[PDB]
């Protein structure tokens, strides 16, 4: 019993965790074999190949726990500065780089100076705004989840919005959203609720014994999606209800079964009751997120 | 900015958990040097449960009964030991990953990050508090007991807590690293249950002045209150009593943010009565109490917006 949310165990990206120091920018990298990973705005109309011209390599300060790194070189990818070192990390996880849809949730480990404060969970929003906890020096911290063995890198933190949410990229240097990395007149687009998300939520309710929310109706797609988008929730396609089928067959509440009860919370509101533990209706935990806690998968 | 439920970086304990089994049994336990710390009742039947006599089960037992397995090698058991309600195994290899710890007994209020386990290996981190009745709201499955629950300040892991058992109503009990439980509970399958729960009064406070940080100040009032009148208000709603202790504790965040704790007190005093009509604080539509005033200053900036 009991529903958190749940980070991944951070231990295989704390090892990758480095300083990278350019000028008067200091903030994290991340180190994979001879290579760190790092927001290419520590160099800072910025003309970025005109900038990263002048520098040479031992401009470049970077710090791995006690020790020095010496950079032999660089080059930008994107909106992604890649700094060649002379060592590789031997703490180096099997990992890959992966770009996420909005919906989809990772951990978040935010650094300062090279070294993890802490771990959180976090969901890409559809706005491709996150609801981040970062202060000025948390640049470079990462974004990933973890599929048995093998981390994978979804986000690297750039910047923060004037309304306190953050942005960033993906670890290839492309932006999550229309943002760029530059001092600039920019806000996040209205946000909308990750409806799948929501129902997976009460689907992992009613596995932890909260059924009050539950009516003997059903509805259709369409009706849902009519309802829907008068509430700022996304709209629900044919693939989410395939996704929530086996949540589904677990409870036996089937998916258009349970969108009539998220009908009916939009309307008449919860009326002093919780579900686990919430006054407002919770979407930063996918489909998977519910199943994996609710059966115990380890890494 | 931001307000997030924040766990420790989880990789100092992440190397230090490994896997119990004595019989039918499995559980986690955590190495440390040369010494597996584990919960006692991995030497139980599920029928020994109902009136257990641990010393007259232990003593049947021999070292090699005991499988110690760190991720693919087995630890040879050397021998045992019972402290409280928690089984130290001596093992013959000193764990290369042992970080620099503490064993701390915490206080109701306090928050720590609980890595939960099953079969040895880390599936999750989360932070939750030592409930005002001595229960976790943890998130548990059969397998975790001996998950434990720690804080990282500065480079030592001080352990608090170490995972026995889930009561009928939901929540979870265990006891600190020397094997003392908290709370009035017993690794034992007698009735017992959680006693009423109450909001971390202090907890809430400090959350309320996270929220004057972030630029937050919708629900205070121009109003103050006497600690006792205060007092007599948040035990009409389940809130802790606070304690001279609680207020000189907020000092720092009364300071900070301009606002003394008895005028924090009198908004908190609204805030239970009106509810908070619509809006939200820090993203939420209730009273959060599982930030204590050090967790705020540790996840906040030093500048209020
Ligand atoms: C005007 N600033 C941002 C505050 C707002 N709104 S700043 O401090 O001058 N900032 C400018 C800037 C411009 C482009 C890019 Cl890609 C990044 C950055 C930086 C940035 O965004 N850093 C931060 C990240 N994450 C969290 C933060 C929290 C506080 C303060 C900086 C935080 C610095
Ligand atoms: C009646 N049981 C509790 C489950 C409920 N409601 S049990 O499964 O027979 N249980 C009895 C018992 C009695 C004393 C002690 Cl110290 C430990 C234990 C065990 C226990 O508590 N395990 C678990 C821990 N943590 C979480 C869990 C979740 C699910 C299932 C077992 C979980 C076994
Ligand atoms: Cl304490």
């Given at each position: ?127 491709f ?49 229309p ?21 997976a ?5 009613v596995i ?6 539950l ?51 939009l ?33």
């Amino acid at each position: 019993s009991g529903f958190r949310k749940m980070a991944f165990p951070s231990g295989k990206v704390e090892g990758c965790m480095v300083q990278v120091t350019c000028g008067t920018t200091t903030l994290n990298g991340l180190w994979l074999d001879d290579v760190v990973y790092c927001p290419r705005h520590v160099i800072c109309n910025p003309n970025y190949e005109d900038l990263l011209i002048r520098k040479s390599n031992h401009n470049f300060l970077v710090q791995a726990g006690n020790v020095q790194l010496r950079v032999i070189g660089h080059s930008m990818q994107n909106c992604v500065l890649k700094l060649k070192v002379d060592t590789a990390n031997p703490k180096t996880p099997k990992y890959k780089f992966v770009r996420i849809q909005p919906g989809q949730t990772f951990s978040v480990l935010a650094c300062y100076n090279g070294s993890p404060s802490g771990v959180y969970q976090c969901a890409m929003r559809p706005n491709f705004t996150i609801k981040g906890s970062f202060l000025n020096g948390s640049c470079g911290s990462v974004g990933f989840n973890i599929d048995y063995d093998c981390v994978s890198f979804c986000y690297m933190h750039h910047m923060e919005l004037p309304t306190g949410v953050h942005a960033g990229t993906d670890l290839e240097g492309n932006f999550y959203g229309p943002f760029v990395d530059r001092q600039t007149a920019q806000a996040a687009g209205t946000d909308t609720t990750i409806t799948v998300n929501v129902l997976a939520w009460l689907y992992a309710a009613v596995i932890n014994g909260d059924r009050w929310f539950l009516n003997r109706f059903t509805t259709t797609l369409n009706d849902f999606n009519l309802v829907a988008m008068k509430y700022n929730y996304e709209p629900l396609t044919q693939d989410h209800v395939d996704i929530l089928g086996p949540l589904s067959a677990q409870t036996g509440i089937a998916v258009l079964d349970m969108c009539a009860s998220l009908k009916e919370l939009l309307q008449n509101g919860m009326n002093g009751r919780t579900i686990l533990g919430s006054a407002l209706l919770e979407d930063e935990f996918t489909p998977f997120d519910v199943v994996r806690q609710c059966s115990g998968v380890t890494f």
